[PDB]
């Protein structure tokens, strides 16, 4: 009943209705956009994140920074 903050909001997902992971050029080739994760489970599999400084894999949970 003390209520110092009146709630705690819980996360809503981003809900963006597209992937946009691929590009095609001059009648099309496959074009990966991110550095492919070298993890054994998903090698040449799922893609890594593109943050402002680093890359990040959602499955294998490993990152590559560029200092």
């Amino acid at each position: 009943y003390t209520t110092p903050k009146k709630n705690k909001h819980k996360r809503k997902k981003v809900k963006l209705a597209v992937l946009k992971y691929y590009k095609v050029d001059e009648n099309g080739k496959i074009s990966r956009l991110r550095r492919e994760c070298p993890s054994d489970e998903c090698g040449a599999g799922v893609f890594m994140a593109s943050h402002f400084d680093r890359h990040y894999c959602g499955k294998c949970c490993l990152t590559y920074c560029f200092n």
């Binding site: 992937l19 095609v24 099309g28």
Partner: protein, 122 residues
Amino acid sequence: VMDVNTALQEVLKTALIHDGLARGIREAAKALDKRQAHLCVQASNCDEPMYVKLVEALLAEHQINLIKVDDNKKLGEWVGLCKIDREGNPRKVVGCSCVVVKDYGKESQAKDVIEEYFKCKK
């Protein structure tokens, strides 16, 4: 034309009751990029060109067969992606737009896609 469309009906039915076949764009991409996937099935009534040019241009650079069906909704009813009661909705979901068969389960009705690949190579 019955002996090909009903043929891959039986093929995808035995595939989904025997294992998991990929349903939807992301599992389709991640399943056909791996070098074990069999033929893809994708819809014809897509409303945007980058989706279709993506899926055909990205299956043609592999060595995998393709069969195209007219509507996505009735395909999604076919692919088991529903909650079908026998007296209610046939497809209460927006049907699937593209699948890929990872495995056939068994070799009962593989002759249909064999002659499909034959007429593709004709």
